[PDB]
Amino acid sequence: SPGIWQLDCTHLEGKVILVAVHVASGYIEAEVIPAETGQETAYFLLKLAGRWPVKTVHTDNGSNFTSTTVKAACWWAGIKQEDGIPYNPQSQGVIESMNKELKKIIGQVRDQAEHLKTAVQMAVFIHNHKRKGYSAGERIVDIIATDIQ
Amino acid sequence: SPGIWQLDCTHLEGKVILVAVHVASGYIEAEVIPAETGQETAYFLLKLAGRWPVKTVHTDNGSNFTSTTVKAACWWAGIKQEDGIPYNPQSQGVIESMNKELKKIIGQVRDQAEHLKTAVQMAVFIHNHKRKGYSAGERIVDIIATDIQ
């Protein structure tokens, strides 16, 4: 559970926002791309795994699960690529509510930024720093540090 | 010191690699841009501070220290923008050796990747996972978790 992440893809402004969620903490990382492709998803996972100790990624859909490029990046970075079937049905709700919240935040910041990619990183920042108590950025470090020890 | 980062800009292939180093751990994040501008540096710091608790950034040169756009991002993300004068002379040496190591790794992976940006993230990943026995990725989480506790 310190090493499990879920991918999530949402749309705004004609663009795609790819999100990785660290399941145990709710910490996220995200980027904007014109369209979800295996190549863009593979690069995003390579970024994520150089930053945090990614053991398993639950992919966001069956095309990214199938994609040879995504499988190659998961091989390269040492990630176990898994499906993202909500065998726990609470998962669909949690992801959907996170995407709503993120879009609400983006709307709240959107006029401070020339580009959507700025507004999405402002939203990542607000999400990860929000105290709910500890923030998700505190929870993810506590969780991994406890694993390392 | 859990919150202190240093910016560093190095060149390869006609492109610019911007690196942020977490000084106490040697953990890095990096990206490839066509040229170093205040706008690109500001976006990179907004990304970094949504991912880690960035208290202070030592900027890499006086243009990024002066840049109103960089100052606006550091204000937005709650970062103290400082100069990066090597008041400790060991700094110039450590950064130069880091840039050399990174370029060495990039050359070792470069034929595994179509784009330089891929090879640079491969290098970030290898740097941060290298045991030298803890890795930089373990050391940054240990440091920040110790500060949070």
Binding site: Q39, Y43, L46, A72, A73 | E114
Partner: peptide, 8 residues
């Protein structure tokens, strides 16, 4: 293209 970032 047989690269990690583009297996075509």
């Amino acid at each position: 293209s047989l690269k990690i970032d583009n297996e075509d």
